[PDB]
Design a protein around this ligand. Structure first.
Ligand SMILES: OC1CN(C(c2ccccc2)c2ccccc2)C1
Length: 119
């Protein structure tokens, strides 16, 4: 029932995501010189360095907020891909499955801790 435990759990999951070769296209903001039309399609860029920095700044109040930003990395990849068979998008799908598999217990434990706090 530790209400704060999610933070270190998210730091550890971000460390694993950074070791994953599938995260390379998503570690830093999409290069606007490489993809000059990016901002015509994507309204809110997001990347894993921005997520890690937001967490370390103490600017996430819950793991649900972190999850919303990580899911935005994947929805941006899906919205920008010219094809559902493209390399970068294909990497995003594997990384998303890995993320969802690991974040589920982080979210469940946090929500359970908050419910216990208000028991
Ligand atoms: O609390 C976290 C910060 N995330 C938002 C956000 C992302 C970038 C800049 C400002 C704010 C957001 C995510 C996805 C859609 C729209 C906004 C949710």
């Amino acid at each position: 029932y530790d209400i704060q435990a999610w933070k270190k759990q998210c730091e550890e999951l971000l460390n694993l995501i950074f070791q994953c070769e599938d995260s390379e296209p998503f570690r830093q903001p999409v290069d606007l010189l490489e993809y000059p039309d990016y901002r015509d399609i994507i309204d809110t860029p997001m990347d894993f360095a921005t997520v890690r920095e937001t967490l370390e700044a103490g600017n996430y109040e819950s793991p649900m907020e972190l999850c919303k930003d990580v899911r935005l990395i994947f929805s941006n990849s899906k919205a920008y891909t010219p094809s559902k068979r493209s390399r970068i998008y294909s990497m995003s799908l594997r990384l998303s499955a890995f993320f969802e598999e690991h974040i589920s217990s982080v979210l469940s434990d946090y929500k359970s801790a908050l419910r216990f706090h208000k028991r």
